[PDB]
Design a protein around this nucleic acid. Structure first.
Ligand code: CL
Ligand code: CL
Ligand code: K
Ligand code: MG
Ligand code: MG
Ligand code: MG
Ligand code: MG
Ligand code: MG
Ligand code: MG
Ligand code: NA
Ligand code: NA
Ligand code: NA
Ligand code: NA
Ligand code: SR
Ligand code: SR
Ligand code: SR
Ligand code: SR
Ligand code: SR
Ligand code: SR
Ligand code: SR
Ligand code: SR
Ligand code: SR
Ligand code: SR
Ligand code: SR
Ligand code: SR
Lengths: 156, 172, 29, 142
RNA sequence: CUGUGUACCAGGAGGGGAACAACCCAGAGAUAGGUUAAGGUCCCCAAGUGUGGAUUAAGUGUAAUCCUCUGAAGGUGGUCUCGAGCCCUAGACAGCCGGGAGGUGAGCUUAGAAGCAGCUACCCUCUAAGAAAAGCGUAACAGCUUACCGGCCGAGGUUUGA
RNA sequence: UAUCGACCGAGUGGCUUGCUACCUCGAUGUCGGUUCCCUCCAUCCUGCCCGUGCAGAAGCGGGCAAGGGUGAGGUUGUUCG
């Protein structure tokens, strides 16, 4: 199904699992990447900031995450970097798949609501920003236009 | 912005609306330098290119106008000359100047001669496997040269294996 | 004001006792 | 021929639309206007885009018909008609007391209307009515 | 499709919006003079081809609202404006000319590898420079280069943010 | 990155299908075919081009391009195939 069907916050928050059942698992493999054994004690901290409020399905969350991290293997399988996708897909989404009769939909997926300006991804690295390219690929697979933002780096 | 081109001593420059004419011993050339808000004039023994505008687009043309005029000075004095060679592998290619156009016969074995008309007072002198294109107007000369190389253009087959043709060997 | 240009002039002027600009620089001593 | 015009306009190097606007304005004021040197009037912009528009008008049509002029004669007089209520008595009268010519059949040199002149030294993206006509295929009578 | 509050259409003229139930002005006895509203003032068509200034070259645009007026993700040395860091008349940035040199063909490896297959180290002379060689190139050499230095030239250049 | 091309993401069309129930129930005749006329381009051929894992011959892929052309037959009412 197209992102067109769910990218907008056009429905009330539907996340209570005590009342919703049969929610598909998440396609997002991990939320912590890189040397997650270590702390965010790095020199440079870049982040991908979404420019529009939107709902991002776990479908796109996993494609963007892979697209970025997989590429961040320009540093090495066990390289010296950190990477965190900080949002979780809490919104349960449905699809009415009798025409418009009794059309409440059936759970078909989950998405993460992200407001304009929130950062969806954050990386921590040493002056080794192959990450800015990692996000160019990441922002390439999520609905909104985004802006890559270096948070702590005067090391031009 | 304004630029001033000191004109060579054997040369003479004259304006006429938007047209400029440069005359030296090697002949003369007349061009047209028409762009918005760019005045080109002959003050005494210097050519001036000026404009009140300074935007990227205006500055671009000013620089182009300059080279065009310095090229004209050079054309009417030392003249312009491009060198060429005819390289064939199997079929003996015959290159000749007949009238006001160069004719290439038996190219790659063809029965029909290929030909290109020469541009302006450009003279094409052929001597053996070498050709030399020369004249005061670089535009007219440059084209003629290129025109000859383009005349042996080949799209159908693999160029790496079929290289017969007249190529430009020397650029001024 | 690179120091290496400053130190070079020092070396040049020292030999005059015992880049062209750096030579004219030493000459003015 | 013989057109006893009260005003003879010189369209040479003048924004066609801007000239047409004033000429209609006057014909409706009772003035008999003669526009001269139509082949030399101009219209600003990209020649390629301008010509596409005039070529499209030539291609349009059908049985009922959409006759569109190709010579500067008609391109101009049509332009003027678009600024007149020609289907009305008052508007047809004005329009009919207006004629456009190729070159200048009169002895007087026409006048140049204020604001309608284009300064060739400051403009490069513009086209001549004559050039449109030739591209449209008209027989260069002028 | 189905709620809710409200004003409107329905049952609301007249002015505007090309036309146009509910968008804008406006709520309206007759008649008359005047001044405005919305919306307009190049012509069609009443009023500006108004003033000071900027941007745009695509006819972009000349389209408030909209079933009705599209234009997106992604990109842009198109162009205008603003800012930050750094380099620069002790000559920058680019171009052109010249120099690019010895130990040494480094050692190991291997028939061989000599800047450049691989591994390791990556030193010192001459000097204004010149890597235990960054990129081609040979079977390997060679050859072209380039880093680096000097000359000619002479004015801004370069990097990044909005 | 000749060529093929998943995931995910953004669109255009209004050719399929679905949805809606705005128009028409004091009637807008249904599918397929046929005949005859106009058109669209997201181009199958023809013209001119680019790339190639282009020697050639031939392919493969791409670009401009709607002037013209795109036919005969077997099953099936078929459209489609
Ligand atoms: Cl017609
Ligand atoms: Cl212009
Ligand atoms: K009916
Ligand atoms: Mg009613
Ligand atoms: Mg008026
Ligand atoms: Mg438009
Ligand atoms: Mg009925
Ligand atoms: Mg096409
Ligand atoms: Mg072939
Ligand atoms: Na017509
Ligand atoms: Na039928
Ligand atoms: Na066609
Ligand atoms: Na059949
Ligand atoms: Sr909703
Ligand atoms: Sr039903
Ligand atoms: Sr995006
Ligand atoms: Sr007027
Ligand atoms: Sr005005
Ligand atoms: Sr103005
Ligand atoms: Sr409609
Ligand atoms: Sr809109
Ligand atoms: Sr866009
Ligand atoms: Sr097309
Ligand atoms: Sr073809
Ligand atoms: Sr079937």
């Amino acid at each position: 199904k197209p992102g067109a069907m769910y990218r907008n916050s056009s429905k009330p928050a539907y996340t209570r699992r005590e009342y919703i059942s049969g929610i598909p698992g998440k396609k997002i493999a991990q939320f912590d990447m890189g040397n997650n054994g270590a702390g965010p004690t790095y020199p440079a901290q870049v982040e991908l900031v979404v420019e529009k409020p939107v709902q991002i399905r776990h479908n796109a969350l996993e494609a963007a995450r892979v697209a970025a991290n997989r590429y961040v293997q320009n540093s090495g399988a066990a390289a010296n970097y950190k990477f965190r996708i900080r949002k979780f897909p809490f919104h349960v989404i449905r699809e009415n798949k009798d025409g418009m009769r009794a059309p409440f939909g059936k759970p078909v997926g989950t998405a993460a609501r992200v407001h304009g300006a929130n950062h969806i991804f954050i990386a921590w690295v040493n002056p080794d920003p192959n990450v800015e390219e990692a996000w160019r690929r990441a922002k390439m697979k999520v609905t909104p236009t985004i802006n890559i933002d270096s948070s702590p780096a005067g090391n031009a | 912005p304004r630029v001033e081109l000191e004109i060579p001593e054997d040369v003479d420059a004259e304006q006429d609306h938007l047209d400029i004419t440069v005359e030296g011993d090697n002949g003369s050339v007349t061009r047209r330098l028409w762009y918005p808000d760019i005045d080109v004039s002959v003050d005494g023994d210097t050519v001036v290119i000026e404009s009140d505008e300074d935007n990227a687009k205006t500055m671009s043309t000013i620089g182009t106008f300059q080279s065009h005029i310095e090229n004209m000075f050079h054309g009417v004095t030392e003249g312009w000359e491009y060198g060429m060679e005819v390289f064939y592998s199997h079929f003996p290619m015959q290159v000749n100047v007949e009238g006001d156009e160069v004719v290439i016969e038996n190219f790659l074995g063809e029965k029909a001669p290929r030909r290109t008309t020469i541009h302006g007072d450009t003279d094409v002198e052929i001597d053996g496997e070498e050709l030399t294109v020369s004249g005061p107007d670089i535009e007219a000369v440059g084209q003629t040269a290129a025109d000859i190389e383009q005349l042996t253009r080949i799209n159908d087959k693999d160029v790496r294996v079929f290289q017969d043709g007249v190529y430009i060997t020397r650029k001024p | 004001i690179p120091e290496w240009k400053q130190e070079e002039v020092d070396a040049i002027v020292e030999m005059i006792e015992s880049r062209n600009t750096l030579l004219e620089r030493a000459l003015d001593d | 021929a013989e057109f006893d015009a009260d005003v003879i306009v010189d369209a040479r190097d003048c924004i066609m639309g801007r000239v047409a606007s004033q000429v209609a304005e006057q014909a409706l004021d009772g003035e008999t206007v003669a526009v001269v040197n139509a082949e030399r009037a101009v219209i600003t912009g990209r020649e390629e885009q301008i010509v596409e528009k005039y070529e499209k008008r030539v291609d349009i049509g059908n049985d009922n018909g959409y006759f569109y002029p190709k010579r500067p004669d008609g391109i101009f007089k049509r332009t003027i008609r678009g600024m007149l209520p020609h289907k009305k008595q008052r508007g047809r009268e004005a329009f009919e007391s207006v004629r456009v010519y190729l070159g200048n059949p009169y002895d007087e040199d026409g006048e140049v209307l204020d604001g309608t002149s284009l300064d060739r030294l400051s403009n490069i993206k513009f086209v001549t009515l004559g050039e449109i006509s030739e591209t449209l295929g008209a027989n260069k009578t002028w």
